[PDB]
Design a protein around this ligand. Structure first.
Ligand SMILES: *[C@@H]1O[C@H](CO)[C@@H](O[C@@H]2O[C@H](CO)[C@@H](O)[C@H](O)[C@H]2NC(C)=O)[C@H](O)[C@H]1NC(C)=O
Ligand SMILES: *[C@@H]1O[C@H](CO)[C@@H](O[C@@H]2O[C@H](CO)[C@@H](O)[C@H](O)[C@H]2NC(C)=O)[C@H](O)[C@H]1NC(C)=O
Ligand SMILES: *[C@@H]1O[C@H](CO)[C@@H](O[C@@H]2O[C@H](CO)[C@@H](O)[C@H](O)[C@H]2NC(C)=O)[C@H](O)[C@H]1NC(C)=O
Ligand SMILES: *[C@@H]1O[C@H](CO)[C@@H](O[C@@H]2O[C@H](CO)[C@@H](O)[C@H](O)[C@H]2NC(C)=O)[C@H](O)[C@H]1NC(C)=O
Ligand SMILES: *[C@@H]1O[C@H](CO)[C@@H](O[C@@H]2O[C@H](CO)[C@@H](O)[C@H](O)[C@H]2NC(C)=O)[C@H](O)[C@H]1NC(C)=O
Ligand SMILES: *[C@@H]1O[C@H](CO)[C@@H](O[C@@H]2O[C@H](CO)[C@@H](O)[C@H](O)[C@H]2NC(C)=O)[C@H](O)[C@H]1NC(C)=O
Ligand SMILES: *[C@@H]1O[C@H](CO)[C@@H](O)[C@H](O)[C@H]1NC(C)=O
Ligand SMILES: [Zn+2]
Lengths: 680, 136, 68
């Protein structure tokens, strides 16, 4: 079957480049109808193939090499080199379940460093080749090529520029920063009880204590940050196995939700062709929830559903992709997508929000008609939402802002990892535990960076999701808070939803938003109205706390020693210049001095290397900080009092290696002491 | 043919350089003792000198380490042979003529790290050359 | 350690060869000087180091059992 789909897959791809090279026979500005212009521009798009034919095969070699490094990485446990852990099984489980500080610090660092280095040279060669392909298609860089999805040209008042997306993201983000600061302060106060003597009460959060490998979602911090742990968060999984609900009941109650709002039934080919469970055969078949739109009005759902409220909800999510697909099936073929890249997931998740409410669960038969929702359980529910929704918004905004500045050249390649960690402390409020120089590439250790994907679609989908939900609940005549809303039994709300679903790509997306919301731009005020019961409760829990963070604190910067070097004072017109070969000799001289101290004082032999001296904050005056680490235990920092005694023992030897004289090589905090004079 | 073998030949011992160190001649009653921490500092000073030669002459950046300097035949008089290898290619030995040019470029820096004076740190086969005198 | 040793090819760290399949085939079939020199050294060094401390502790305990 794989050979059955590779030849049938290439007949589709070879056919499309043949019609693409036929499309440049027609000019594009001699067209008047907006629909036939939109189909022509989506087919005329050259994309690749604008490069030289030896540069085009170099780019595909880089994209295949970066993709197989990410999926085949082995991490070695420094106590047993015969057991290598590989990213998805084993390294993702440590970052999501462990409470050991030293084991989370190990998994972060190792993985990072290794994959980092590899993806470095490759990613560097990837930026040059992608900017050449974008400038041959008349964009300024590859970041402007990614923002071409949101572009709208000449439809009388609904236009949108590719540079206008940058201001609308930064204008909407500075209204989330009051809400994110109070969530950052509450999580920091709860993490100090889980990790004492590791977290500052006025500083950033360490990057390896956030719940996963990159801090993208904070959703694994719920067991440490739960407001009222003596109240069970509502879970209807036992009431499903007490009424003998089969595999088919979960979709038939899902189809009754959509026919309740005024949307069509399933297509009745949906029930035979689909595969709602893994089969009765032990059948090798990728088990991953998804919605297929094969064509010719044939819609199938592929998932392996278990009787759980989790897959009761993603059944409502995956059916939402189908009802979006069944609506625009009357457009031409090249306009059968969502209106932008963000609308398709956003319509799927407002079906899941409306089905997870306890108002909907007690009317669908799954909750005791004598159930009492208290105000303590609504805080437990809203905080679990904010760890996934609000916690991912400064991560998404910071990452696309870094990638946009790399493509246009505002960040040169000698400052990639310098500007990356300055933007973590300032925007996200997250500090690294170990300093990282320009041999690492920490963005490329994420999936979407090393596999060539755009990331701004996760920011805009979060904002469209609550704009849709607030506009539908005013049509369904809701009375309470926004997070209690349900659009069942309405017809007027579904008519408000169906007027957008059938457009496809035939209209500009700004014209699609006014059919539901009533505005021409994305707005953050419906997102904040969802979380005002949490924002009121959060401001009362932070009366004795400090809201905000300092970008100066680090988890290593209290065992560091500052070094200051004055070369032109000692030698003057005859002094060498301080390149990074002199930094290599300095790190070997400190590692030599630590070896001599532990042998002659502590009677131990420890093999310190130059890779165990970690240098941060290199300035032009020639100043940096350093701290010393045990040879393969990255979590073991030698204390500052033992490094001062080691440097005092061998200060005369370090001075002679650089021709300095204790006034041109200063260790700040260590002073020369002895020397009584006399002789007469 | 020749029947039998010699126990003196080695496949690396024609790109090796012999080093001789006379500690008690340079300092005398006040000289440190040569443990294996001093051999670690010597292997880092040679790796530093190979880094500076390839950057300023060959315009390349190569990350030589102390594990790329291979020391053999350590004696009590303080003498050994060493040869330099490319950073992870164990089969690539840097030639003897390129290591002599790298040591000549940074001999004054290696001497200062050990307080020796070109008669107490001898690289056998490399000689000091310059120094014309005058002033009147 | 002897039965589960991985050797990494310095041009692709994502492919580790383990003694009986792959490292014994290089030493028995190759005519490349630089590839035989790599397989010898690598394997040697790694397993070498490990078996060192262990083998050192093994001599002391086996001499105690023999002298009793
Ligand atoms: C060009 O634009 C016109 C309107 O601007 C489209 O005309 C409509 O076409 C459909 C079927 O093709 C008719 O049912 C409508 O009644 C037409 N509208 C009007 C106002 O006459 C036309 O379809 C566009 N061209 C293409 C190829 O789609
Ligand atoms: C697709 O690539 C072609 C080049 O192969 C681009 O085209 C040319 O258009 C100019 C006019 O601007 C002509 O003078 C050239 O003759 C065309 N190419 C040649 C030499 O055949 C074209 O602009 C690209 N299309 C897109 C999507 O921008
Ligand atoms: C849930 O509602 C109850 C009922 O109002 C709240 O209890 C009140 O809390 C305030 C502030 O601490 C007190 O001044 C009142 O006297 C309490 N009412 C009673 C009847 O004792 C409770 O604080 C609410 N919980 C949350 C999380 O909002
Ligand atoms: C929302 O829709 C459901 C589904 O039709 C309605 O549920 C019915 O409720 C009545 C009385 O409450 C029962 O006698 C029926 O058996 C229910 N039908 C099903 C299929 O379970 C519900 O009443 C509707 N809500 C409103 C306010 O009309
Ligand atoms: C690496 O160093 C850390 C200390 O920084 C070690 O953690 C200690 O582990 C022991 C037992 O495992 C505990 O009794 C100590 O309380 C731990 N120290 C701290 C500060 O938490 C860790 O064991 C070291 N790892 C290795 C492999 O030696
Ligand atoms: C390691 O160094 C050796 C040389 O000592 C390299 O072998 C050369 O390989 C090229 C092509 O592979 C041949 O043209 C040369 O004739 C080889 N040299 C010798 C002396 O045989 C080897 O390629 C290097 N390995 C790496 C990974 O760089
Ligand atoms: C959808 O199907 C049900 C039975 O499966 C049927 O009763 C209902 O009328 C259908 N909806 C419409 C709009 O016909
Ligand atoms: Zn989805």
């Amino acid at each position: 079957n794989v050979q059955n789909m590779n030849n049938a897959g290439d007949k589709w791809s070879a056919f499309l480049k043949e019609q693409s090279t036929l499309a440049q026979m027609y000019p594009l500005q001699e067209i008047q109808n907006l629909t036939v212009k939109l189909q022509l521009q989506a087919l005329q798009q050259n994309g690749s193939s604008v490069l030289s034919e030896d540069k085009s095969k170099r780019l595909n070699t880089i994209l295949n090499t970066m993709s197989t490094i990410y999926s085949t990485g082995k991490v070695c446990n420094p106590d047993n080199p015969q057991e290598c852990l590989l990213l998805e099984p084993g390294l993702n489980e440590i970052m999501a379940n462990s409470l050991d500080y030293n084991e989370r610090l190990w998994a972060w660092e190792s993985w990072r460093s290794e994959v980092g280095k590899q993806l470095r040279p490759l990613y560097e060669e990837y930026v040059v080749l992608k900017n050449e392909m974008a400038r041959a298609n008349h964009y300024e860089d590859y970041g402007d090529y990614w923002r071409g999805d949101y572009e709208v040209n000449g439809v009388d008042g609904y236009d949108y520029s590719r540079g206008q997306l940058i201001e609308d993201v930064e204008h909407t983000f500075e209204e989330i920063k009051p809400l994110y600061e109070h969530l950052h302060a509450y999580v920091r106060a709860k993490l100090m009880n889980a990790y004492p003597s590791y977290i500052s009460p006025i500083g950033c959060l360490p990057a390896h204590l956030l719940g996963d490998m990159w801090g993208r979602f904070w959703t694994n911090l719920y067991s440490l940050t739960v407001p009222f742990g003596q109240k069970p968060n509502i879970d209807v999984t036992d009431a499903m196995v007490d009424q003998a609900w089969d595999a088919q009941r979960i979709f038939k109650e899902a189809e009754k939700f959509f026919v309740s709002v005024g949307l069509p039934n399933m297509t009745q080919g949906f029930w035979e062709n689909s595969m709602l469970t893994d089969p009765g055969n032990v059948q090798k078949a990728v088990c991953h929830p998804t919605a297929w739109d094969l064509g010719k009005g044939d819609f199938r759902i592929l998932m392996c559903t278990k009787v759980t409220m989790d897959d009761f909800l993603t059944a409502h999510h995956e059916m939402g992709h189908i009802q979006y697909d069944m609506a625009y099936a009357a457009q031409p073929f090249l306009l059968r997508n969502g209106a932008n890249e963000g609308f398709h997931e956003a319509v799927g998740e407002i079906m899941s929000l409306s089905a997870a409410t306890p108002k909907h669960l007690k009317s669908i038969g799954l909750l005791s008609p004598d159930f009492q929702e208290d105000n303590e359980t609504e805080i437990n529910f809203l905080l679990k939402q904010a760890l996934t929704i609000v916690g991912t918004l400064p991560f998404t905004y910071m990452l696309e802002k870094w990638r946009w500045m790399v493509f246009k050249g505002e960040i040169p390649k000698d400052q990639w990892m310098k500007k990356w960690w300055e933007m973590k402390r300032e925007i996200v409020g997250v500090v690294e535990p170990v300093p990282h120089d320009e041999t690492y590439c920490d963005p490329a250790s994420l999936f979407h960076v090393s596999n060539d994907y755009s990331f701004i679609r996760y920011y805009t989908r979060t904002l469209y999701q609550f704009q849709f939900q607030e506009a539908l609940c005013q049509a369904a005549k809701h009375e309470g808070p926004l997070h209690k809303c349900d659009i069942s039994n309405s017809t007027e709300a579904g008519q408000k939803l169906f007027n957008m679903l059938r457009l496809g790509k035939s209209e500009p997306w700004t014209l699609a938003l006014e059919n539901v919301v009533g505005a021409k731009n994305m707005n953050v005020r419906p997102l904040l109205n969802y979380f005002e019961p949490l924002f009121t409760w959060l401001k009362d829990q932070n009366k004795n706390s400090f809201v905000g963070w300092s970008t100066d604190w680090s988890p290593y910067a209290d065992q560091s020693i500052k070094v200051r070097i004055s070369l032109k004072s000692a030698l003057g017109d005859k002094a060498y210049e301080w390149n990074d070969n002199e930094m290599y000799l300095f790190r070997s001289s400190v590692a030599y001095a630590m070896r001599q101290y532990f042998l002659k004082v502590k009677n131990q032999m420890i093999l310190f290397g130059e890779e165990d001296v970690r240098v941060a904050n290199l300035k032009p005056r020639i100043s940096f900080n350093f701290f010393v680490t045990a040879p393969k235990n990255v979590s073991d920092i030698i204390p500052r009092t033992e490094v001062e005694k080691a440097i005092r023992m061998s200060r005369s030897r370090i001075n002679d290696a650089f021709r300095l004289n204790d006034n041109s090589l200063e260790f700040l905090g260590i002073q020369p002491t002895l020397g009584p004079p006399n002789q007469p």
